[PDB]
Subunit: 122 residues, 4 copies
Amino acid sequence: EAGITGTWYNQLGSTFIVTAGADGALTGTYESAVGNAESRYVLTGRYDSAPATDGSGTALGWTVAWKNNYRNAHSATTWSGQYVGGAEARINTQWLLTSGTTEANAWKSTLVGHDTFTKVKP
Amino acid sequence: AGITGTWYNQLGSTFIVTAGADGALTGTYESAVGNAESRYVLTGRYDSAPATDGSGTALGWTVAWKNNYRNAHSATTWSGQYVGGAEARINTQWLLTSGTTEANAWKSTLVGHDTFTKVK
Amino acid sequence: AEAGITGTWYNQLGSTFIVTAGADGALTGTYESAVGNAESRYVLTGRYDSAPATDGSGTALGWTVAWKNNYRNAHSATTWSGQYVGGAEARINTQWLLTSGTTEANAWKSTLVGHDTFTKVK
Amino acid sequence: EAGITGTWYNQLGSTFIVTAGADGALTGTYESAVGNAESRYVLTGRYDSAPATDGSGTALGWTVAWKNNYRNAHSATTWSGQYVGGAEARINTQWLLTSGTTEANAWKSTLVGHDTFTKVKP
Ligand SMILES: O=C(O)CCCC[C@H]1[C@H]2NC(=O)N[C@H]2C[S@@]1=O
Ligand SMILES: O=C(O)CCCC[C@H]1[C@H]2NC(=O)N[C@H]2C[S@@]1=O
Ligand SMILES: O=C(O)CCCC[C@@H]1SC[C@@H]2NC(=O)N[C@@H]21
Ligand SMILES: O=C(O)CCCC[C@@H]1SC[C@@H]2NC(=O)N[C@@H]21
């Protein structure tokens, strides 16, 4: 909720800096430790601003297009996942990284993986 | 943009989007299926300087399935590419994550693929 | 059993899937890809629901190819997970995961994801 | 032939018992700790029987159809991933669980997740 805003780090050492707005907006920057990336990229996404009463995770997702002032990878990643708060707060995601490709190469356009974000660098 | 406009997928969902000069996607999504009614806000990003060698334009966007009427406690992200020209298409794969208790997290996420066209 | 599975199938990429469905759930056959790091036929094995529902629902199944044969070794494996539907427009509708062997540093980009639809003609 | 051969457990406590044959076969049983499943199910799959020698993992995949003598969930899972040997040996996977569905429900036929296996008995 409010618990989402701030800096998060994944298992690769990437840095996810986000603000969760009152009704569901996510805005911030992403800096990847790997791949065809340097410095920060804009991200935007959405989260459930009124998660379930049973303490289920807070669903959210966000997108990075891998273009910034320094570099353009011609690709975009979406992370889809859920935030869980508490002493071991986490954002558990799966992601789809699509590169722009010709139609013939479209079958190999999309990588899939999973990132776990924590409040401390692993 | 190119990307800007009203799109429909194979399910009959409606994707109304505007592509900004800064790489932003903004608009609304209305799903023909699932735990959804009416329009939901979406935001996303696209490559605003794509390759000129015939490649598609990479993009993605998110919907959290809460609006003024309903809350599914879930979010879909679509990742894909825009292919322009006479019969422009957006081809995607998506991940739908539901918020879940710890016991149910293994089954939190559905995966699929949606193809969008501007044909009503 | 689901006798409708056994035979030759073709996907939208021009690949050929030749399979035998055993009475109690075995899939065995060969796969020839029209794309990627692949030449000639590769062994496949998998499983299917040999007593599917009779309400018109599909028959769940999946199979694996490791991309090594007598000609070539791509150091990768693909699994297709999907469902068979019979009738006049019989199809096997799948999603797949193609994992390459990688070093630990490159494991984040080990897996491609996509979808293939197999039909009895094309 | 085999590092891969053995009894493995994932983060859910599920048990994967596998034999890796000299030419690329995987056979064994799977018991899920979760879902519409009880006791053991047959699996088959394939792995790269001549992996790279540069420190890369060994690609593999396998399928379970969730029908056995006790229960039938009309579903199948495939795991695609790689085996990383040494200490601590691990098989890192992503999986697709497809249920047989009507055409109207096919959009929600397939779950996706990731399982990591080790030889450590919970
Ligand atoms: O190589 C590219 O096309 C851009 C960089 C992609 C970095 C990926 C990698 N970094 C990260 O923090 N999680 C994974 C998923 S993100 O697509
Ligand atoms: O490049 C490789 O590593 C081996 C060949 C992969 C071919 C892929 C491609 N061919 C096909 O019929 N469907 C898709 C998914 S399979 O992983
Ligand atoms: O059921 C839910 O949790 C919310 C609605 C989900 C609808 C999904 S999003 C992916 C797919 N494409 C669509 O247009 N609708 C379904
Ligand atoms: O519920 C079903 O349809 C059958 C059981 C599915 C269990 C899944 S397979 C992927 C994940 N890993 C496991 O060890 N169990 C769950």
